[PDB]
Design a protein around this ligand. Structure first.
Ligand code: FAD
Lengths: 133, 6, 665
């Protein structure tokens, strides 16, 4: 029903190797060349990646900004309201980004702000101006 | 034949 | 066992009637199931009796004497059974004490060509049935392909050597009748490479395992895939082995290719990530400078200037978040590449050192079939498998010749008598022979029947060594050409001292090339005296025949020195080298199922020849020309027991023809 273990013999493979007088060595050469072709392609991309790794040397260490551990607040200072209006203009509906720009407002408070100061800060106009970009 | 196989 | 074991020992199913039995007892096998079981018991019990004591004749009287009810109630059934078993050499064959001294006068006359085992076996049977029998032997000795070298205390077989198990072997009976010293063969066979160094148990076991697996693979190719014809030519075993090896070398490459293909896919996936990381570290580098410039506007600042600082701060930490998640991915893929590159698939299928040790295993097979594997039939080379005996193989320690010589006792054997022509006609036969010494001194033999046990190689001779008048029919001659007759040689080395491992019966030698794998590839230590026996097989067998004894013994010592020490191997006192293909009375060693042949050809060979009538319009004549021999027995070819049985077979068929079958009624 099946070949022995560690022995590979498919109907197609037999026909391919016995197709002619030297189809045997032909098939084994095409795979010998395919192996060289793929082996040098490895070293090429290994060389390419080796160069790209040296350009990433140092990491992003001289570019990290320290942690600001500020605590959340309920009161909207005139300053914080103004930061918000500008954050909407630059980020749109991304409530997470806006929350980070302000620093002391939760993602839900940001959403509350959108409804609370809707008419006073013309948030409709501010959002449609954002869509123009 | 196979029989003689050492 | 008991009664059922006797049936097995006689190569018969204990609980079923054979085709031959159906012919002789058609009343029983077509009759009720009850009668059949009575028949079977009678048959089996009679066999047991003969087997339990094979050194005396078993008569009908003695048989009936030791039967129970209702098995001894029907005495004509018992008589029919006994006669049948006696006729076909199942009981009372070989060398036994005869109770009723031979019939006073003989009936019918048979000439038997050749006094090999098959000839001798048949002769004894025909004489047992009271017929005039004369054997014509070209050699100055009996036994033919059972040859035994004897000189001083040295005893070594140049021909047949091994009893291939006693379980169902007729030779088991013969060995109880003749003083045969049967010694078991120890399976272990240490190999030694060209240099003289032993092959480590690591390789030894894992090359042999591959060999056995390569064979099973060819069987799969043959039966399951039906790979049996290639460009009209029938596929050989050698062809199929090459095809299998190639496909195994192919798979090795297929594995390697898709392994490195796994590497490039990950390596090229890593390439894309590194580009993304470089482009992000570039934008981070820029964004930091912008945030820095924004913080140069010292407080107090208006809200847009404040927003700019806060904005660029958020934007930077967002891009720092991304880069760290990409450095996370980089670490995972970078070790996933150390994973795949750490465990590569197989480098090669077999090395040059491996392929040489595998060639020894091919040589072994080439010895067993006495032929290059390129000649064996893929489909049928092993067709006689199912009929192999049980038990360990043995060697005849006192020389195999002891058997033919024992069989030759009390028989009219004309030695040095080379049959030149066989003439057979409706009224009878004449055989024309000559004296091998003075070839002009001619003999003529008139007989009712000729039994031809000429070796297949002889029958193959071109131009014919024996002429048939009239010529043998197309169906017979085609069978002769189709069939394979192989070759295998032995080198006998007689020393004054045992320098080999006494507990090791046989040790191999691995040749340098495929072309010379058969050349002195195996050595036998079997005998009482210090004798080493070296085989020449495969393609090497035929070529070593054109080389002188000195050179052959040379290469033998060379090898043995390399294994045991260049000073531990003395000069051989006596040496013999067989040349079976050269031998005109053999023209080879034994038969093999050649590509384009089958087991059915062996049957064709056993089929007798019936001449045309003298007067046209006269009744269909009696069969006159009969064939026995190793090449006629489909289920036991190329062996002694096979020959033995073929002889018994024809003797039965001949006696049935000329003395009549009294047991069929
Ligand atoms: C090297 C070797 C090793 C073997 N080892 C084994 C083994 O281990 N086990 C095993 O079971 N079998 C073995 N065999 C096979 C076995 O020996 C034979 O199958 C068997 O002996 C053949 O018997 P036969 O009667 O059919 O042929 P033969 O024994 O050859 O009988 C035929 C006879 O006819 C004679 N003859 C030929 N031409 C003429 C003529 N023109 N006129 C008159 N007579 C003629 C021959 O001289 C010969 O005596 C081996 C064979 C060889 C060659």
């Amino acid at each position: 029903r099946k070949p022995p273990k560690g022995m590979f013999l498919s109907q197609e493979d037999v026909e391919a190797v016995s197709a002619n007088a030297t189809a045997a060595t032909t098939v084994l050469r095409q795979l010998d060349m395919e192996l060289v072709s793929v082996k040098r392609q490895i070293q090429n991309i290994k060389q390419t990646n080796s160069a790209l790794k040296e350009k990433l040397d140092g990491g992003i260490e001289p570019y990290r900004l320290p942690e600001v551990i500020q605590k959340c607040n309920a009161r909207w200072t005139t300053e914080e309201q103004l930061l918000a209006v500008q954050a909407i203009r630059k980020y749109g509906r991304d409530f997470q980004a806006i929350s980070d720009v302000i620093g002391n407002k939760s993602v839900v408070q940001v959403k509350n702000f959108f409804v609370n100061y809707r008419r006073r800060f013309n948030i409709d106009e501010v959002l449609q101006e954002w869509e123009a970009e | 034949p196979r029989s003689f196989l050492v | 066992s008991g009664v059922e074991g006797a049936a097995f020992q006689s190569r018969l199913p204990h609980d079923r009637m054979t085709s031959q039995e159906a012919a002789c007892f058609p009343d029983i096998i077509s009759g009720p199931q009850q009668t059949q079981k009575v028949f079977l018991f009678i048959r089996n019990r009679t066999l047991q009796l003969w087997l339990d004591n094979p050194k005396i004749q078993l008569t009908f009287e003695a048989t009936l004497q030791q039967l129970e009810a209702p098995y001894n109630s029907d005495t004509v059934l018992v008589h029919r059974v006994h006669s049948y078993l006696e006729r076909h050499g199942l009981i009372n064959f070989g060398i036994y004490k005869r109770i009723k001294p031979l019939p006073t006068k003989k009936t019918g006359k048979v000439i038997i060509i050749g006094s090999g085992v098959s000839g001798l076996a048949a002769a004894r049977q025909l004489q047992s049935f009271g017929m005039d029998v004369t054997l014509l032997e070209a050699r100055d000795r009996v036994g033919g392909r059972v040859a035994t070298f004897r000189k001083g205390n040295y005893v070594a077989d140049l021909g047949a050597m091994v009893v291939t198990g006693l379980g169902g072997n007729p030779m088991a009976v013969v060995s109880k009748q003749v003083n045969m010293e049967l010694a078991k063969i120890k399976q272990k066979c240490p190999l030694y490479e060209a240099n003289g160094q032993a092959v480590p148990k690591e390789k030894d076991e894992m090359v042999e395992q591959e060999f056995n697996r390569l064979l099973e693979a060819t069987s799969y190719l043959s039966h399951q895939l039906d790979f049996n014809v290639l460009n009209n030519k029938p596929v050989s075993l050698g062809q199929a082995l090459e095809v299998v090896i190639q496909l195994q070398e192919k798979h090795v490459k297929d594995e390697q290719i898709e392994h490195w293909k796994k590497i490039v896919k990950t390596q090229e996936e890593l390439k894309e990530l590194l580009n993304k990381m470089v482009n992000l570290k570039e934008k981070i580098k820029e964004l930091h400078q912008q945030y820095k410039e924004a913080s140069e506007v010292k407080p107090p600042r208006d809200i847009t200037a404040e927003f700019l600082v806060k904005s660029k701060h958020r934007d930077l930490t967002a891009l720092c978040k991304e880069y760290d998640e990409l450095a996370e991915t980089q670490g995972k893929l970078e070790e996933k590449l150390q994973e795949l590159e750490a465990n590569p698939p197989s480098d090669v299928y077999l090395s040059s050192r491996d392929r040489q040790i595998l060639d020894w295993h091919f040589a072994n097979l080439e010895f067993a079939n006495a032929t290059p594997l390129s000649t064996l039939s893929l489909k049928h080379w092993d067709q006689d498998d199912d009929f192999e005996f049980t038990g360990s193989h043995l060697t005849v320690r006192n020389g195999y010749s002891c058997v033919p010589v024992a069989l030759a006792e009390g028989l009219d054997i004309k030695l040095n008598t080379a049959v030149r022509q066989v003439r057979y006609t409706a009224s009878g036969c004449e055989v024309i022979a000559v004296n091998t010494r003075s070839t002009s001194q001619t003999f003529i033999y008139k007989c009712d029947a000729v039994l031809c046990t000429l070796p297949l190689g002889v029958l193959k001779q071109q131009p014919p060594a024996v002429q048939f008048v009239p010529p043998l029919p197309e169906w017979k001659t085609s069978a002769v050409q189709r069939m394979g007759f192989g070759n295998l040689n032995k080198v006998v080395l007689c020393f004054d001292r045992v320098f080999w491992d006494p507990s090791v019966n046989l040790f191999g030698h691995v040749g340098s090339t495929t072309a010379s794998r058969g050349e002195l590839f195996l050595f036998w230590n079997l005998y009482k005296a210090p004798i080493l026996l070296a085989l020449v097989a495969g393609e090497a067998a035929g070529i070593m025949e054109n080389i002188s004894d000195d050179v052959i013994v040379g290469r033998c010592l060379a090898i043995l020195k390399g294994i045991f020490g260049s000073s531990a191997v003395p000069q051989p006192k006596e040496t013999v080298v067989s040349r079976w293909r050269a031998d005109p009375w053999a023209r080879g060693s034994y038969s093999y199922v050649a590509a384009g042949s089958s087991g059915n050809d062996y049957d064709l060979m056993a089929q007798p020849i019936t001449p045309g009538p003298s007067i046209p319009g006269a009744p269909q004549p009696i069969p006159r020309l009969f064939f026995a021999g190793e090449h006629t027995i489909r289920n036991y070819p190329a062996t002694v027991h096979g020959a033995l049985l073929s002889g018994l077979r024809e003797a039965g068929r001949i006696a049935d023809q000329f003395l009549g079958a009294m047991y069929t009624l």
